[PDB]
């Protein structure tokens, strides 16, 4: 019993964190095999950030301009190349702690663990979701750039996020491990802003199924809804539209609890209308949207 | 910016998790140097009588895909100590520490000696933890990290009828009035950790949330008369001293923040949230707030 915001054990990722320094800028890098991956903005100064020409800044650098530190050991850079917004530094030593891994690009609504690092040293681990507006609500200070997001389903680490910047509202933007930003963000100090955020509907439904599995049913009602009527109501509360894919994805949780997806949708419509009236659901007074259907199945009893 | 329920990096603890099997019971063990620590209930009660009937070879200890051989066994309170023939080469610098209610720690939840997740929690004033554990999680441990030293503070033993959890320190002493046996047991009435809510209000101010601030202040005695009414733990002068640094950083005196908390208890949030929460959060200590708002590494 119980339901917590649970992160994957971070050990496999801790053994990959290194510190990267170029001139006066120091940030984090991910050391996998003989390559260190880091945000390309490590080659910029604060002035460069308004309109940096990364190709022009990079051509002026040599291998020995990049200082890479793994623990108390300096790694030697023997090559460098840029792939989108990431810099790939070829080093002379393969990481003996390299786990089994993949690079995966995730969709909004998907969750992952973040190992927040400063100076190549891990400071903490927490759970995050890629918001519908492609930002993440992380906890990052200056020097956190290069910290990564990942999932570890079955001994393989799937790296899905690398931290690059904080937007004016305090939210965070970054790339996949191939250097493609999530959302319309750019690694430039331009007037950029997160778009209007929405609630991840399929995740709230998943969390309501977790509450039923753990023994709470107070929010259920005798009603049902069509998918279209549910979407017309939910969009009025800034909830993402629920698609037939989301309904199919919720099938297993529906079968385990005996509550049809559209019946759980009617319960959500009523919760949006009434609020909780002094009650809680899994220790929360707000509707939680950072647990996916897969996360609920992973954590909850069968 | 941002404020999350953050756990310590778990790698140093992952390298200590092993699977322990005795008969039909399988649970988790903590392998440090040449000893595996696990709940004594793995033997299945008169524990001295049950233990004397077991031999070293009755305990199967598995570290990854390697079987460790047990060469000795002894009991210390509610913890079984299995002497093994191999010292753990991954043994980190460590201590066994007993924590107080209100203190937080990270839990590395394990099944079959394999870590499945990490989360942060607090020892409640009623000595239970609101964890997330299924059958087979027994022997999972709670810890903190200070620089490079792992301080082990909790070992999971059981789930109470309300779904909350009970366990021991690593010397086998229970937190709370619990016993390791199938008998009628219940969590006592819980209270809210006042010093932790105040710490979280300071974290909200640091992150730019100030709507709850007011021009008022209070005395410790008047605030404590309010805390008692709302099932909040009493605030002591030690708590006030501990909050000093956060008070100096934000410019809001501790009794000034106490007046803000009193108004929140008496009037609610009125449709507003604090750090994305509609409830007053009590599972962040003053040190957790300072550490997350400064970026301390391990
Ligand atoms: O965002 C960036 N860094 C950070 C990242 N995360 C969490 C931070 C917290 C606190 C300070 C920095 C943080 C950097 C620096 N900033 S900054 O204007 O100095 N800024 C303060 C809020 C962001 C411009 C910038 C522009 C583009 C790029 Cl790719 C990186 C960056
Ligand atoms: O509590 C224990 N295990 C668990 C521990 N944590 C999370 C569980 C979730 C689900 C099932 C077990 C779980 C065990 C078994 N139970 S039990 O009656 O089978 N029970 C169901 C709720 C607890 C009695 C018992 C008595 C004493 C001792 Cl020390 C351990 C234990
Ligand atoms: Cl995805
Ligand atoms: Cl006994």
Q: What is the CATH number of the domain that holds B206?
A: 1.10.1840.10
Contacts of A198 (CB under 8 A, 6+ apart): A132, A133, A238, A239, A240
> Which of B224, B200, B190, B221 is closest to B276 using CA atoms?
B200
Judgement on whether residues A7 and A89 belong to the same structural domain of the protein: no
Max Cα–Cα distance, chain A, nearest Å: 69
Domain end (from B30, B61, B92): B92
**Distance from first CA to last CA of chain B, Å, rounded?**
20
Cβ–Cβ under 8 Å, residues A239 and A246:
no
Same domain, B126 and B5: yes
A70: its two tokens: 């793994």
Residue identified by tokens 């710490």 is B199
What is residue B226's DSSP assignment?
Answer: H
Q: Counting runs of H as helices and runs of E as strands, what totals does chain B give?
A: 8, 13
Last residue of a domain, one of A174, A197, A220: A197
Please tell me the distance from the alpha carbon of residue A17 to that of residue A32, in angstroms, as a whole number: 9
B163: left (phi over 0), alpha (psi -120 to 50) or beta: left
User: Taking a C-beta distance cutoff of 8 angstroms, is the pair B51, B58 a contact?
Assistant: no
Cα distances (angstroms) measured from residue B15 to each of A32, B11, B64: 20, 7, 10
Neighbours of A302 (CB within 10 A): 6
Same domain flag for B204 and B171 = no
Q: How many domains does chain B have?
A: 3
A166 Cα to the center of ligand 1, angstroms:
5
The H or E element that residue B287 is part of is helix B286-292
Is residue A302 within 8 Å of residue A123, measured between CB atoms?
no
Which residues pair with residue A70 across a beta bridge? A73
Contact B79, B38 (CB under 8 A): yes
3-state helix, strand, coil in chain B (%, to 5): 25, 30, 45
What are the φ/ψ torsions at residue B50 (nearest 5 degrees)?
-70, -40
In a shared domain, residues A126 and A189:
yes
* Gap between the Cα atoms of B143 and A185, Å rounded: 38
Residue B286 in tokens: 């003053």
**Which DSSP state fits A245?**
H
Strand ranges in A61-193 using DSSP code E only, listed in sequence order: 66-70, 73-75, 77-83, 86-91, 100-103, 111-118, 121-129, 148-151, 156-166, 172-175
The closest of B266, B237, B245, B239 to B202, measured between CA atoms, is: B245
Based on the fold, state whether residues B6 and B29 are members of the same structural domain. Answer: no
Task: Select which of A22, A44, A128, A145 is catalytic.
Answer: A145
| Contacts for B155-159: CB closer than 8 Å, 24+ residues apart | B155/B30, B155/B37, B155/B38, B155/B39, B155/B79, B156/B39, B156/B107, B156/B131, B157/B39, B157/B41, B157/B78, B158/B41, B159/A1, B159/B133
User: What is the best residue among A54, A84, A148, A166 to mutate for testing ligand 1's pocket, by most ligand atoms within 8 Å of CB?
Assistant: A166
What technique was this entry resolved by?
Answer: X-ray
Give the nearest partner residue to B6 out of A4, A126, A283, using CB atoms: A126
Query: What gap in Å lies between CA B62 and CA B80, rounded to an integer?
Result: 16
Q: Are residues B105 and B167 in the same domain?
A: yes
- Is beta strand A100-103 parallel, antiparallel or unpaired with respect to A156-166? parallel
- Would you call A141 and B10 a contact, using CB atoms and an 8 Å cutoff? no
Could you tell me the resolution of this structure in angstroms? 1.8
Are A144 and A155 contained in the same domain? yes
Do A187 and A278 fall into the same domain? no
Same domain for A155 and A130: yes
First to last CA, chain A: 11
The CATH number that applies at residue A86 is 2.40.10.10
Q: How many CB atoms lie within 10 A of CB B51?
A: 14
Spatial CB neighbours of B251, under 8 Å, sequence gap ≥ 6: none
Among A165, A181, A197, the domain-final residue is A197
| Alpha-carbon span B203 to B274, nearest angstrom | 10
Q: Are A104 and A159 a contacting pair, CB within 8 Å?
A: yes
Decide: helix, strand or coil at residue B28.
Answer: strand
Window A:281-300, CB contacts with B under 8 Å? 283-286, 299
A172 classed as catalytic: no
Same domain, B1 and B110: yes
Selecting among B16, B22, B78, B138, the annotated active-site residue is B138
Number of H helices, E strands in chain A: 8, 13
Distances in whole angstroms, Cα of residue B291 to Cα of each of A143, A147, A148, A182: 15, 17, 20, 29
Q: Could you count the other beta carbons within 10 Å of the beta carbon of residue B265? A: 18
Identify whether the C-beta of residue B39 lies closer than 8 Å to the C-beta of residue B157: yes
Domain that holds residue B54: 15-92
Angle CA B232–B234–B238, to nearest 5: 135
DSSP A19-56: EEEETTEEEEEEEETTEEEEEGGGG--TTGGGS--HHH
| Residue B220 distance to chain A (closest CA, Å) | 29
Q: Any idea what DSSP says for residue A113?
A: E
Distance from Cα A151 to the centre of ligand 2, integer Å: 29
> Is A286 within 8 Å of B276 when comparing Cβ atoms?
yes
- Whose CA is closest to A295, among A125, A152, A139? A152
The Cα B170–Cα A247 span in angstroms is 46
SS3 content of chain A, % helix, strand, coil (to 5): 25, 30, 45
Residues B250, B105 share a domain = no
Question: B282 in helix, strand or coil?
Answer: coil
Residues B10 and B135 in one domain: yes
């Amino acid at each position: 019993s119980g339901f917590r915001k649970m992160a994957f054990p971070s050990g496999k990722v801790e053994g990959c964190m290194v510190q990267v320094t170029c001139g006066t800028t120091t940030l984090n890098g991910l050391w996998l095999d003989d390559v260190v991956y880091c945000p390309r903005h490590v080659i910029c100064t604060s002035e460069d950030m308004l309109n940096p020409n990364y190709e022009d800044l990079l051509i002026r650098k040599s291998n020995h301009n990049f200082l890479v530190q793994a623990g108390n050991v300096q790694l030697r850079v023997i090559g460098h190349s840029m792939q989108n917004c990431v810099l790939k530094l070829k080093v002379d030593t393969a990481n003996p702690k390299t786990p089994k891994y993949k690079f995966v690009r995730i969709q909004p609504g998907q969750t992952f663990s973040v190992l927040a690092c400063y100076n190549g040293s891990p400071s903490g681990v927490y759970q995050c979701a890629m918001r519908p507006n492609f930002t993440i609500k992380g906890s990052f200070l200056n020097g956190s750039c290069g910290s990564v997001g990942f999932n570890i389903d079955y001994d393989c680490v799937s790296f899905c996020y690398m931290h690059h910047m904080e937007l004016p509202t305090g939210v965070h933007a970054g790339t996949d491990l191939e250097g493609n930003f999530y959302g319309p963000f750019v690694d430039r100090q331009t007037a950029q802003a997160a778009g209007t955020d929405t609630t991840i509907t399929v995740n709230v439904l998943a969390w309501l199924y977790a509450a039923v599995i753990n023994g709470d049913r107070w929010f259920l009602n005798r009603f049902t809804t069509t998918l279209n009527d549910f979407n017309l109501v939910a969009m009025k509360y800034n909830y993402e539209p629920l698609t037939q894919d989301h309904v199919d994805i919720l099938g297993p949780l529906s079968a385990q609890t005996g509550i049809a997806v559209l019946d759980m949708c009617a319960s959500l419509k009523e919760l949006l209308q009434n609020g909780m009236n002094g009650r809680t659901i899994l220790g929360s007074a707000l509707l939680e949207d950072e647990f996916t259907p897969f996360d609920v199945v992973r954590q909850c009893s069968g």
